[PDB]
């Protein structure tokens, strides 16, 4: 018969396989089963789902607000008084805000985590459109952090690194960015800088190399390529 | 030898990643597919293999390493037991 | 469509505003069972020793065995990559590793898919034979 | 067994008998060593 | 002509002979990292530069970075190094609810030369352009010989008549650096909270891996590029 | 099959190797001769050597026999007129073929010019 | 079928049969008497555990299982498959065309024993692995069996004793 | 009597180096060794491939991993086993750091190592 093919809830969650188409102590098992079912490939505080699982599933199956509500509520009231959970929730919320295109909420959320006053001032300047001032603030923050009087997180490090480049792009510093991308092997940034600040397209000598780069970055198609 | 003792892709940046992983003797772990995969690419870039390696090479290498260690240990054991 | 990996070299997971995305990315690998790999790699050697002799090594022998494994890998790979580049290849394949393993170490792994003398040698041998009679 | 010894004895079966500036270094070296050992952990 | 060092070199002799001179190095030690006097960054105790600290424990010259010492012009005093050590060792993070308005002891020590240091010196001289190089390899041995003549001008050449005299001489010529003992043999609830934390970190790109030495390489590269571009612009 | 019984039966299992050769090679290797060593142990060692040689002979006779296009294998130069009559000749080729299975290389050049 | 007769009543995956076929193909490609005492002379004058386990299993077998076992016992690489076997083994690529039928029968006899030996060793390895933890055979058990079957008697390296030379040989023909 | 060339040459080279006598079967031993080495090297180079010079160099480099670790090499020359000098220097540093053993006049010349390391009960 096998060849031809709370109890109800558990059976549905993990008892059956859909590939063809409640004691508290037992809830964790159902949570694990639901996590397993959510991420299966064949597709296409009582109940807790990891923030990043919800984020990843929403970004692909159009469930933005459903995940955002839980993320913001957890931010308001953490489920577990731990640093790792708070970090993960904040990172997922920031990623969703950035993807959704809400600059104001992203900057506001990030301004509540930054420890350096220089980072806060840089973000404030970035919000209002003063790119050079924000770049200077980021440089000052990095220089201050070089000494080592007070520790800092890796998120702020990455934020400085990325936002300096963003401000440089907004300020049309393509000559610097081209060398930076060539040194750091940033293919997308290199292509963007070359498409703007050179004439490699006139002759095959450089066009062949540019096409080689394009076909190299074409294994992960996106609308911008 | 004395020096050994005293548009484009920046391949040196990728090659310098070989020294950012602990050795088996340092971590106390027998090498597996993941570690061998991490080791493969800098070697390929050193030799001018710009297309990397085949997807199925790391598993083959791990099997070969286990076979080699088993042979050495068997040879040692059979002479003293 | 087919799940696609991350390419470009910019990096993934950075909590910044440099978002860019693929139509369908591939789900990162994860496990929620309880037996981690960092612990199983610390029992793989014991499993092998159990296999051959059928802990069982002193602290000073396990160190040498781990050194052996490190040296074997960082040696076979070095030879095979240069051999692959010799014959005009831009990629490393199992055939090069197999050649090195079979000719330098006598190791054969199953399941992964002539010289003759020419006329001058024959002439010299004929001359010697004619002289010998 | 650093102090394990046998002796030469020609009257035995095998010929062997088995017995059956501030803070100058000299005055602060110990304190500095304690601090450095704490640093090295 | 030069004065040779004594048979046993001690911190007292060097610190008394070379008073009034600047120290060779100055190092500041903190809770989890250390730095040098004029350095901008920091070195963690778990980093490769940990090796230097070990030398500070053994009062040995750190030959593994000798080149870097020669580049900077570090002074030597009879082949030893004088080092001063400064000792400074002796809420709700990442929560939006937080408020905000914008919301030592001194030691002096001496490190003594070794044979690896002399080997390193000669090897470095062999590859240092000035003949081409400062030292030709075929002349290495001769040069070494002369150096030895300047380090051990006196030896104990009087013979002994019996084993008791040899025992007494071996007792009398003992050296502290070669008087150690043999080494030691080689040797080999919160669970629920940890499990919940691990479960809540599922599918995390970076935070999951952990369950940190900033070198600012990118910023230094950007500064170098900016300096080079400014120099190029100034030419035109 | 005990070792004690075998060593006690060493009277009937003595090999064809003279005692002088055994003593000479035992001394070269580092073992004092049977005046101080037991004669039975030396006899056992000589018997093992004889067995090894007989194995290497039985092979290479098999190789000679299966051999009875058509040119010799390079690297085994030897011989003269080739003997006479339909007799079996021990040649360098057969010995090399046989001993390659024991891990020995005996290859030479045929001519020197 | 061949695996089933050798005590493997499970359902092996594709990888296991693939690796077994690879090993058998490699062996086949690598592959009175002339040397008898009568050959000493120039004139010739005309003259004049496995079984016990199999028996126990057969006794334990039922009628239908016994019939299935008897039917499966007759599996062959070459029987009524001469052209298929010759194409598979690359006869023309390693030897002149059309070897006689006796060669084909001998190769059929040898391949069956190859498979049987491999299966019987892999089963023991699998059982020993199962015991220590407290389903069919998998590719790693076949790998271990192949590693065991490639070991040579100590007589073939006795002339390298006391030295630091590596032993290099050909593929052993089990 | 006939004698091949390169044999007279090897013997003259030996004489020029201060050897006043040698056995007759040294020249042919050397010639056969050269034959074997050439055959092995080029058989290796054949598989890595017409054969180029790069294949020959790679075959030689591969062979150099397990044999010929000798010769009369000097400063940073791979002779005597091929060990690096810095490694030997640090091994010497580890060894020479221990105090010399203390021996009384009554045990000078008569004391031996421990029972574990001597040949007792071997007959």
Model description:
- Chain B is 60% helix and 0% strand.
- Chain B has 81 residues and is mostly helical.
- The radius of gyration of chain B is 17 Å and the shape is extended.
- Chain E is built from nine helices and five strands.
- The chains are: A mainly alpha (225), B mainly alpha (81), C mainly alpha (133), E alpha+beta (236), F mainly alpha (113), G mainly alpha (174), H mainly alpha (123).
- The interface between A and E is large, with 49 and 35 residues.
- Discrete helix count of chain A: 12
> How would a crystallographer describe the biggest sheet of chain F?
none
Largest interface: A-E, 49 and 35 residues
Shape of chain A: flat
Described by the principal axes of the CA atoms, the overall outline of chain F is elongated
Number of strands of chain A: 0
How far is it from the N-terminal to the C-terminal residue of chain F, by CA? Answer: 58 Å
**What's the SSE pattern of chain F?**
HHHH
Compute the number of strand runs of chain F: 0
Percent range for β-strand residues of chain A:
under 5%
**Rg over alpha carbons of chain F:** 19 Å
Structural class of chain A: mainly alpha
Q: What does the oligomeric state look like here?
A: part of a larger assembly
Estimated helix fraction of chain F:
40-55%
Subcellular location (chain D): Nucleus
Organism (chain D): Chaetomium thermophilum (strain DSM 1495 / CBS 144.50 / IMI 039719) (Thermochaetoides thermophila)
Protein name (chain D): Putative transcriptional coactivator HFI1 protein
Family (chain G): Belongs to the SPT3 family.
Secondary structure layout plus pairing:
This is part of a larger assembly, with eight protein chains of seven kinds.
Chain A: H1 7-15, H2 27-38, H3 51-61, H4 64-76, H5 83-100, H6 103-111, H7 117-128, H8 131-147, H9 154-170, H10 174-184, H11 187-194, H12 204-216
Helix pairs in contact in A: 3-4, 3-5, 4-5, 5-6, 6-7, 7-8, 8-9, 10-11
Chain B: H1 2-5, H2 11-15, H3 24-27, H4 33-46, H5 57-78
Chain E: H1 11-17, E1 25-29, E2 33-36, E3 43-44, H2 50-58, H3 66-71, E4 81-87, E5 105-111, H4 115-126, H5 140-151, H6 163-172, H7 190-200, H8 207-210, H9 217-235
Parallel strand pairs in E: 1-4
Antiparallel strand pairs in E: 1-2, 2-3, 4-5
Précis, in short:
Chain A has 225 residues and is an all-alpha fold. Chain A is built from twelve helices and no strands.
Which keywords apply here?
part of a larger assembly, 8 chains, B: 81 residues, mainly alpha, 5 helices, 60% helix, G: 174 residues, 8 helices, globular, transcription, ctSAGA complex, Tra1 module and Core module, Non-specific serine/threonine protein kinase, Putative transcriptional coactivator HFI1 protein
């Amino acid at each position: 018969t096998v060849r031809m093919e709370s109890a109800r809830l558990a059976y549905v969650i993990l008892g059956q396989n859909w590939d063809t188409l409640v004691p508290k102590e037992d809830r964790p098992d159902l949570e694990r089963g639901l996590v397993t079912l959510l991420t299966k490939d064949y597709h296409s505080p009582h109940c807790k789902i990891p923030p990043h699982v919800l984020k990843f599933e929403a970004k692909t199956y159009d469930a933005w607000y459903t995940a955002l509500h839980q993320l913001e509520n957890a931010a308001i009231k953490p489920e577990i008084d731990s640093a790792a959970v708070r970090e993960s929730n904040l990172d997922a919320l920031v990623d969703l805000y950035s993807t959704l295109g809400e600059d104001d909420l992203f900057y506001g959320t990030w301004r509540r985590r930054c420890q350096f006053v220089e980072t806060n001032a840089g973000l404030s300047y970035e919000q209002h459109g003063m790119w050079e001032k924000a770049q200077r603030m980021y440089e000052s923050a990095q220089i201050k952090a070089r000494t080592g009087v007070i520790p800092f997180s890796e998120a702020e490090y990455m934020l400085w690194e990325d936002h300096w480049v963003l401000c440089a792009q907004k300020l049309q510093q393509w000559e610097i960015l081209q060398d930076f991308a060539k040194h750091e092997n940033f293919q997308d940034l290199l292509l963007e800088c070359a498409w703007r600040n050179t004439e490699y397209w006139q002759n095959q000598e450089n066009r062949d190399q540019l096409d080689t780069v394009i076909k190299g970055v074409m294994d992960a198609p996106t609308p911008r390529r | 030898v004395l020096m050994e003792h005293a548009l484009k892709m920046n391949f040196d940046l990728e090659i310098r990643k070989r020294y950012a992983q602990p050795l088996a003797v340092e971590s106390g772990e027998f090498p597996d597919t993941s570690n061998i995969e991490s080791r493969m690419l800098p070697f390929c870039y050193e030799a001018g293999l710009s297309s990397g390696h085949a997807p199925d090479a790391a598993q083959f290498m791990s099997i070969a390493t286990e076979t080699f260690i088993k042979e050495v240990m068997s040879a040692i054991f059979s002479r003293t037991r | 469509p087919q799940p696609v990996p991350n390419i470009g070299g910019a990096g993934s997971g950075r909590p910044t505003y440099t978002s860019g995305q693929p139509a369908l990315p591939k789900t990162p690998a994860f496990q929620l069972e309880g037996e981690g790999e960092r612990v199983l790699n610390k029992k793989k050697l014991d499993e092998l020793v159990r296999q051959v002799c059928g802990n069982m090594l002193t602290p000073e022998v396990e160190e040498s065995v781990l050194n052996m494994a490190d040296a074997f890998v960082d040696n076979v790979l070095h030879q095979a990559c240069r051999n692959a580049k010799e014959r005009g290849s831009k990629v490393l394949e199992i055939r090069d590793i197999q050649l090195v393993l079979e000719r330098v170490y006598n190791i054969r792994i199953p399941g992964y898919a002539k010289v003759q003398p020419n006329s001058n040698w024959i002439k010299k041998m004929s001359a010697v034979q004619a002289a010998k009679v | 067994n650093w102090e394990d010894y046998t002796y030469v004895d020609p009257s035995r079966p095998d010929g062997i008998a088995i017995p059956s500036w501030e803070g100058a270094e000299p005055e602060t070296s110990d304190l500095l060593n304690a601090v450095l050992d704490s640093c090295l952990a | 002509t030069f004065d040779a060092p004594p048979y046993v070199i001690t911190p007292e002799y060097i610190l008394k002979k070379f008073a009034g001179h600047p120290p060779s190095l100055i190092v500041h030690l903190y809770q989890n990292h250390f730095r040098f006097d004029q350095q901008e960054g920091m070195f963690q105790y778990k980093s490769p530069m940990r090796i230097f600290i070990e030398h500070l424990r053994n009062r040995t010259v750190p030959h593994e970075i000798m080149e870097y010492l020669i580049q900077g012009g570090v002074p030597f005093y009879e082949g030893c190094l004088i080092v001063q050590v400064f000792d400074h060792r002796t809420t709700v993070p990442f929560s939006i609810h937080n408020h905000n308005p914008y919301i030592p002891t001194v030691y002096t020590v001496v490190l003594m030369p070794t044979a690896q240091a002399l080997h390193t010196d000669l090897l470095l001289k062999t590859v240092t352009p000035r003949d081409h190089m400062e030292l030709d390899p075929k002349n290495i041995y001769e040069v070494e010989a002369k150096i030895l003549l300047a380090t051990y001008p006196k030896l104990d050449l009087e013979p002994t008549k019996n084993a008791e005299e040899t025992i007494a001489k071996l007792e009398k010529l003992a050296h502290p650096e070669h008087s150690h003992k043999p080494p030691e043999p080689k040797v080999r609830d919160e669970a629920l909270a940890a499990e919940q934390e691990r479960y809540m970190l599922t599918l995390d790109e970076r935070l999951s891996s952990k369950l940190w030495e900033p070198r600012f390489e990118r910023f230094k590269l950007i500064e170098n590029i900016k300096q080079e571009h400014a120099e190029k612009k100034e030419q035109e | 099959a005990s070792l004690r019984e075998f060593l006690n039966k060493m009277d009937d299992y003595a090999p064809i190797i003279p005692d002088a050769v055994t003593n000479y090679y035992m001394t070269r290797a580092g073992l004092p001769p049977p005046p101080q060593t037991d004669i039975r142990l030396a006899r056992l060692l000589a018997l093992a050597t004889q067995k090894f040689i007989a194995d290497i002979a039985a092979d290479a006779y098999q190789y000679s026999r299966i051999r009875a296009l058509g040119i010799q294998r390079p690297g085994y130069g030897g011989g003269g007129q080739g003997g006479s009559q339909n007799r079996t000749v021990l040649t360098m080729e057969d010995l090399g073929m046989a001993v390659s299975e024991f891990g020995v290389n005996v290859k030479r050049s045929e001519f020197y010019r | 079928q061949m695996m089933y007769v050798s005590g493997e009543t499970g359902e092996p995956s594709l990888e296991t049969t693939g690796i077994i076929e690879d090993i058998v193909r490699q062996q086949v490609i690598e592959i009175g008497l002339p040397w008898e005492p009568a050959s000493f002379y120039s004139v010739e004058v005309p003259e004049r555990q496995r079984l016990r386990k199999a028996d126990e299993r057969t006794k334990a077998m039922t009628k239908e299982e016994y019939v299935t076992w008897s039917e499966f016992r007759q599996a062959s690489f070459t029987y009524r498959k001469g052209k298929r076997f010759r194409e598979w083994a690359g006869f023309g690529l390693v030897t002149d065309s059309k070897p006689s039928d006796d060669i084909i029968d001998i190769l059929g006899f040898l391949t069956f024993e190859m498979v049987q030996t491999l299966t019987e060793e892999a089963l023991k390895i699998k059982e020993q692995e199962d015991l220590h933890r407290e389903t069919p055979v998998e590719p790693r058990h076949i790998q271990e069996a192949f590693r065991r079957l490639q070991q040579r008697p100590k007589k073939a390296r006795a002339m390298l004793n006391g030295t630091k030379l590596q032993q290099r040989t050909q593929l052993k023909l089990f | 009597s006939p004698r091949p060339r390169d044999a007279r040459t090897l013997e003259l080279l030996l004489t020029a180096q201060g050897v006043t006598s040698f056995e007759p079967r040294v020249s042919q031993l050397l010639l056969d060794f050269a034959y074997r080495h050439t055959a092995a090297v080029l058989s290796d180079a054949l598989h890595l491939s017409s054969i180029t010079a790069n294949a020959v160099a790679l075959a030689i480099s591969s062979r150099l991993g397990y044999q010929f670790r000798g010769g009369g090499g000097g400063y940073y020359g791979g002779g005597g086993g091929g060990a690096s000098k810095d490694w030997m220097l640090e091994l010497a540093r580890e060894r020479n750091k221990v105090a010399l053993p203390r021996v009384l006049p009554s045990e000078w010349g008569v004391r031996l190592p421990g029972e574990r390391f001597v040949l007792s009960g071997v007959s």
